[PDB]
Amino acid sequence: GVLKIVKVYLAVKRRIQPGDKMAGRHGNKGVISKINPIEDMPYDENGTP
């Protein structure tokens, strides 16, 4: 009962977003809460944030 069937493939590129789950290997999990700007992050003495 079908003449022709067409398949169309879509390739989305999902980024990271507040709400996406993120878990370590040791059993620690939790959702992202804010994508802070680079300057607001803490930084050690040498300057690397």
Partner: protein
């Protein structure tokens, strides 16, 4: 009071330098040392590739014969290209290579203005003896990180642009050695740039931004 002046600029390598602002009164040296870092890391005029159009490939997720890298890998390599333009806000870069052997940023034909600061940046490797690649690169100025999504023909690819010449800014406050004063502090700022912006003009722009912002709540 006292006035800080740009006393010494020294470059340890081709990327990062150490500017100096000698006379500062106690407490300032730790206020400017953070203002000029927060301003510097978030708003600087930089140039990065934004649109790459290769001759034969339609979309990103398509392999090209004779190239070791996937087209996605070529795009990600191109995003990190460090180039600077002098006079025009928009420019088109043409790359033409043939034969076996890696391609590099130096292979790009150079106009009068656009010059590449790191001619050892590898873009893609050519494996087959009779393979070729020709791409058009659109390079423009900007400020901050502009994702591709928030910004017509099928044969034109989109790459996220990150206009930010400065990567890692660090500062410290050392006591000055004035022959008759005390509590005077000199400030040293390290700026791990990508090689496009000059240190002194970077400091000048990051201070003009403050001078404009402060004029809001002041006569």
């Amino acid at each position: 009071f006292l006035k800080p002046r740009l006393v010494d600029i020294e470059q340890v390598s081709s990327t990062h330098a150490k500017v100096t602002l000698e006379p500062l009164e106690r407490g300032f040296g730790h206020t400017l040392g953070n203002a000029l870092r927060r301003i510097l890391l978030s708003s600087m005029p930089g140039c990065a590739v934004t649109e790459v159009e290769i001759d034969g490939v339609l979309h990103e997720y398509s392999t090209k014969e004779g190239v070791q890298e996937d087209i996605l890998e070529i795009l990600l390599n191109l995003k990190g290209l460090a180039v600077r333009v002098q006079g025009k806000d928009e420019v088109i870069l043409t790359l033409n290579k043939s034969g076996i052997g890696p391609v590099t940023a130096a292979d790009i034909t150079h106009d009068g203005d656009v010059e590449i600061v790191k001619p050892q940046h590898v873009i893609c490797h050519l494996t087959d003896e009779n393979a070729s690649i020709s791409m058009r690169i659109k390079v423009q100025r900007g400020r901050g990180y502009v994702p591709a999504s928030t910004r017509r023909p099928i044969g034109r690819l989109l790459v996220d642009a990150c206009y930010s010449p400065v990567e890692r800014i660090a500062y410290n406050v050392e006591a000055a050695r004035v022959e008759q004063r005390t509590d005077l502090d000199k400030l040293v700022i390290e700026m791990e740039t990508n090689g496009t912006i000059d240190p002194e003009e970077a400091i000048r722009r990051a201070a003009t931004i403050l001078a404009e912002q402060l004029e809001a709540f002041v006569d």
